[PDB]
Write a protein that binds this ligand. Structure first.
Ligand SMILES: Cc1ncc(C[n+]2csc(CCOP(=O)(O)OP(=O)(O)O)c2C)c(N)n1
Ligand SMILES: Cc1ncc(C[n+]2csc(CCOP(=O)(O)OP(=O)(O)O)c2C)c(N)n1
Ligand SMILES: Cc1ncc(C[n+]2csc(CCOP(=O)(O)OP(=O)(O)O)c2C)c(N)n1
Ligand SMILES: [Mg+2]
Ligand SMILES: [Mg+2]
Ligand SMILES: [Mg+2]
Lengths: 559, 558, 558
């Protein structure tokens, strides 16, 4: 009865029922059957394990766990750890290490200084030294992971100590996992909130810019009630899409710095130009809705609300800074503004018309489909297949992703899932895995570009093996298209050796992995393939040839 | 004319003609056409780029370069960096970073503290701060990389500084070291003479040769020493081929798994009567450990390395000679010029056991056995290669230790695998690097289903570059090595940690534009190997295998 | 108009009027007259600068600043930074660095990797890279220093950039937090309520109060709670004085040395019948550890802190309230509003014992006893000081623990010592900081010969600033605490590790321009103290002492 047992048992005390990973030779010390109610989920690559855990933690709000072996195991996991640190999710990352008496980093076979490597990108990082302490290390790891900004905690596990029963006896203390993320709270935040209320009092066209920390705080219903009473528009970051329902009159959409260039439309100006008060509710610069994006048209005042002290005063100096829990802010604000009447909201119908026009695009293109037509087809079938307020569209990283941000349906919080802070290509499959496990009876669609999908396509076999009924659409232009865009922005020409691929047949790729698939080259074929996939009761992949036709000169907002 | 040009131009001065990588949004600052003579090689994942650079550097003995974007780019590359630090290769690893005025690690979009992450696994790690200094940073990175123990140097490149011409005026000589700079102790000559005196007294000495001897350029000299004094040469995994196949002093490679695989007292046969072990170019990371040769009688040891001993807790040689390996061997030649040849000890029972595995004529109900697969590969490699040429590459897994024991190596680095880092997925990138380094030689890759599929997407890269690599994927629907360890530790398995469903590697290969076939016995496999070797295009062969391992024979692993 | 001006002007925006330090060659880039309202305070050693800033910050509750040159300036300062990080104090530590283009750690003259060295002992550590950004770096430094656990932030300043005006134009509000930003867990009110229920069922609860309680502004509220429900108050070292001297609920301070010093079961008396320990503002660094209150019957514990518990291996409170201390007390007042007062437990045998030490009328054959020294200081402090005023500061050593038990404190931080870091030499800088923070109050310092002499040169600083600190040096020609530990460990002494020759601290003080005198008994000490306190100038009193300690009485020190 060993530290491996005490580890798994403590994870389970904190609510963990899955460990995602790839096990190495430390399997001599840990089987993963030692504790009832916690199971191992084997992936093809450690990145997939880390991202699956991150996303399951995002949707559940609870700590999750991933696992890798020593040396290159841990480095592979680290892109998953980086996802969690920048996207903000409470993940406990565990990795084996050389036997304790034999830890000579860069000299012992497969021995790296794991704590030193991972500490700069984590909330907490430690190496196990005395077997019975694994219980308290897991606790301190959860404590740090569950403190805003939420993130991963790392424990390195020498194989000998993992397999040792020394000092381990037969009654664990309470787990005490925080109910929601712990935050910081400034003395005088109430006064700061009252000052925000006095700015709202004077403002003609205020907006709420809502980030993910608002969702983690459990402040979505309260934010919606505030917005509906006062008629304040809600604009979101990528992953706060769906904090209001599709079709809500105050759902002004998500912002991406790519939107003007993709739409050939003055979208940032339409969204922000007449606004005089910006309330960034749960603001986090990592989500990449930056101040320069809303600094359009008239002079604005700003209110920051966050459970963290402002880490970027060089970039964002709010007029009023409210450092407190988002939900506590909103409840205090409701009281302070109870007597206020509703604003006249500003008009963004021209932007909505442009977006709708992209989605309805009936044209046939000689090349492949256009990504907006692809997403419109996914929206239609997602709306049919999901219960109201259910379903998840997942997006990998690429140019197409920002079409996702503009165009994808999101009918609940995290109804559109992508990596905002880290943005590693290959995110899509592990995120779909985590989303489908978190929402076992909801339809899960994934969209991925060819570049990023193939960076991590081997975990198609994991999808087959777990029998997760994800429907994947691969938009293929034999290019790292986003990168060709940047080549042209910077130098007004391409260089193919740095962005171009040959042909991959993703349909046949999927089927090699035991996932049924098909090709679709227009709206009719794509709708039929999506409807088949959604009813299949099994995973399904759809390859769609696309092209972009981008305007390099239209992307000045990215600077 | 920017820091992007000055960077590429400086890599070029140091002999670099290729940069492997995946380019991100730093493409706005660097195109990779700025300098004639340097081409970008685009991979599917940054790990492949790092490993291909590592292997190219190992075979050429010259610094090579790899490239990633900021954030997750850099962390993906880091497994490649880890490969180069533990396997010892001079790689210049480069990665973009957020704009300089906007570097707030873990707060800015995609922004990680790259230097802090990479420093503990590199020789040198720095962030560019003033554009014109990129030239001297590349020089300092080459310097630290080409100092033993050789390894990767890292430079982080803010996108704005990378695309800037501030302070760049329109170059000093490069002075690239021809071989790695080494550590030399005062009095190493005296230590070398004490080593000669132990050799005089010893009846059955052995030379245990590591890759550092190859880097030093000491292969012919070691061979002439060994031949004159009749001293057996035993190698690490990648020092296989320092003697030709069939040379009588070629006593084979060592691996900790050899007794369990052979079901034979192989370490005791190799080492029991030996009274003096000379570890020439010793490196613990290669995983030929002291406990493996400490069989039978007590032995004296001589360590020879261009580094100070980092592991006195594990290895305390009787004589420690800290110097360049070639310098040691030339001094030792003089000190031993008058010695009589030794009576070398007998390992024929081990040789017969290995030969018997290679000639195994049984048909199993399962699939093939891995020793039969490699026998077939050795046969075809000998047909297709000129003498002293050809590379067999191995990915990581249980099958890899069969490669150590059984795979043909007819030159230095004729059998390539990752000994220090041993990341699964190594195979494809290592075969790419190997084939580019030896453009007219046959390159065969053996990989397991577990590791192969961890990095199988760069099959497309092989098709795109049209490198005629022949890959054999030995598939048991399992992380086999790991099931073995489950059984060593607990005398049973647990499938959810090691078992996969079916992957059709034949169809996977063809999805990527690589012709492929399935082979289930020797006849089919020999034909597929011969078709692939003469194809003039990449080819893949999936072979079903099983291991049927005996957990109790693997005590040397602890 | 330069980054030096911008740095000082921004410190001034955050309320800073003094910068303590030693200036090196960066004086070519900063004079310290660029901004009216900020004066430089030159010390003899950088440790003194850091501690003075630390103590000024503790008493004022506002961020303070210290300064050192590159290289050894910065390493000398770092013991001050460590003081601030372990004692919890908001200090902005500033150190110069080599010119930016010439930063090569361990190669350039006086060039150390300052940020890497200080980062592990600070809230925030950064190197200036673009002159105009010094404004936002100061803000980020203040932000991180004024977040619990409060501590120091470090900015390294390359001398070229410090002296550059590039990008500085001729200003946003500073927004300095009035009290520390704290961590608050969702549900803390439910945990508070669960603590109220424990209080209801408890017969003998106690409040154990640490310094975080004082930073929160929670002293009046804690006093009102304790008096209404008749709950005794026990303190850490620097939380002495949260109740006036004489108050019936003032159960004194705890030190792990108290049993050995008093030769009495003091911890047993304090805690044996207690059934509920509320550690209000708990911080393990202060060194009141759970093993100290774990005496007699089983106890339940409530932790209240504006931090998540960093030490669950050592302390697992039955109820953990993570919130601001004042907020806790105010919610706790409400939940317990209708509760009946408790019967407080009896510790008169401990009070009687402490009072016995203070009144000890014997004149000993060798030196005075430290309890007699402190009794004398207490008597004169009470005469010299207005009610609720005065500070006694203690350096580190065996005598310091007599300070903890015996020294009078009639206000919060009326007894100051370093509880977290406990560097010897602390006394002088702490008294400088204390006297400057309380310019019209008497400030007495007690230090031992070992610690005092470790930092005695800053006597010149006290003379130069004309701060009327009265210092008492208790001299036994020994690092006495350490001789204690030699005996605890091995039951004997080893003099080469602990014994000094004679130092005439009277003559040493007068060499620095500070009047002084020797006192060897109560009469002489009282006369010297009363003179010192009315002198209007610094004064130093040397007292010979001895301990005659009993090694077996100190088992609580585990
Ligand atoms: C690990 C990693 N390396 C590099 C990048 C830069 N990058 C972002 S997305 C992407 C893929 C873009 O190609 P694709 O998925 O096909 O989408 P497309 O732009 O063609 O629409 C790349 C290379 C990245 N995001 N992550
Ligand atoms: C990055 C990384 N993660 C985990 C491991 C542990 N490990 C080593 S080899 C290997 C693959 C073993 O399976 P396979 O390639 O099929 O070879 P087999 O043992 O079945 O012959 C694994 C998972 C590893 N080497 N590298
Ligand atoms: C910087 C530092 N080094 C060493 C110590 C260990 N130590 C603590 S106090 C102290 C001084 C003890 O001597 P003294 O000041 O004369 O007081 P005494 O114990 O004699 O009463 C020493 C050496 C320390 N506290 N700080
Ligand atoms: Mg693409
Ligand atoms: Mg296998
Ligand atoms: Mg003393």
């Amino acid at each position: 009865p060993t530290a491996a047992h005490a580890l798994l048992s403590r994870l389970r005390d904190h609510g963990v029922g899955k460990v995602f990973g790839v096990v190495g030779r430390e399997a001599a010390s840990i089987l993963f059957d030692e504790v009832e109610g916690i199971d191992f989920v084997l992936t093809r690559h450690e990145f997939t394990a880390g991202v699956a855990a991150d996303v399951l933690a995002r949707i559940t709000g609870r700590p999750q766990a991933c696992w890798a072996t020593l040396g290159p195991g841990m480095t592979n996991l680290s892109t998953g750890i980086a996802t969690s640190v920048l996207d903000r999710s409470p993940v406990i990352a565990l990795a084996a290490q050389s036997e304790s008496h034999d830890i000579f980093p860069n000299d012992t076979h497969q021995c790296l200084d794991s704590v030193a490597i991972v500490a700069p990108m984590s909330k907490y990082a430690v190496e196990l030294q005395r077997p019975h302490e694994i219980t308290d290390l897991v606790d301190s790891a959860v404590n740090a992971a569950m403190t805003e900004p939420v993130g991963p905690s790392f424990i390195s596990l020498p194989v000998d100590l993992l397999g040792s029963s020394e000092g381990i006896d037969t009654p664990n203390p309470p787990a005490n996992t925080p109910a929601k993320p712990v935050g910081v709270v400034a003395d005088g935040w109430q006064k700061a909130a009252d000052q925000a209320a006095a700015l709202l009092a004077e403002a003609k066209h205020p907006v709420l810019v809502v980030g993910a920390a608002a969702i983690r705080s459990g402040a979505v219903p309260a934010i919606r009630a505030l917005a509906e009473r006062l008629n304040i528009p809600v604009i979101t970051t990528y992953i706060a899409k769906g904090v209001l329902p599709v079709g809500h009159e105050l759902n002004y959409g998500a912002v991406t710095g790519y939107m003007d260039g993709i739409l050939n439309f003055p979208a940032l100006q339409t969204m922000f130009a007449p606004v005089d008060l910006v309330l960034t509710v749960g603001y986090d610069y990592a989500e990449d809705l930056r101040p320069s994006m809303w600094q359009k048209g008239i002079e604005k005042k700003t209110v920051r609300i966050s459970p963290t002290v402002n880490p970027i005063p060089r970039v964002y100096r709010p007029d009023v800074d409210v450092v407190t829990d988002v939900l506590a802010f909103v409840e205090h604000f409701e009281t302070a503004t109870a007597s206020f009447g509703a604003k006249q909201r500003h008009d963004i119908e021209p932007l909505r018309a442009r977006i709708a026009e992209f989605l309805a695009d009936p044209e046939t293109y000689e090349d492949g489909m256009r990504v907006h037509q692809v997403i419109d087809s996914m929206n239609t079938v997602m709306e049919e297949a999901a219960e109201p307020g259910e379903g998840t569209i997942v997006s990998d990283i690429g140019f197409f992703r920002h079409y996702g941000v503009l165009f994808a349906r999101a009918d609940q919080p995290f109804g559109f899932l992508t990596s905002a802070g880290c943005s590693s290509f290959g995110y899509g499959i592990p995120a779909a895995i985590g989303a489908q496990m978190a929402r076992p009876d909801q339809p899960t669609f994934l969209i991925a570009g060819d570049g990023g999908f193939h960076s991590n396509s081997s975990d198609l076999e994991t999808i087959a093996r777990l029998n997760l009924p994800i429907v994947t659409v691969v938009v293929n232009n034999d290019t790292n298209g986003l990168i060709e865009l940047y080549q042209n922005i910077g130098h007004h020409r391409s260089h193919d050796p740095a962005v171009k691929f040959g042909g991959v047949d993703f349909v046949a790729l999927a089927e090699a992995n035991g996932v049924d698939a098909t090709r679709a080259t227009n709206r009719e074929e794509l709708l039929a393939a999506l409807r088949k996939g959604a009813e299949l009761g099994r995973p399904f992949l759809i390859e769609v040839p696309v092209n972009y036709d981008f305007q390099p000169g239209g992307f000045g907002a990215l600077s």
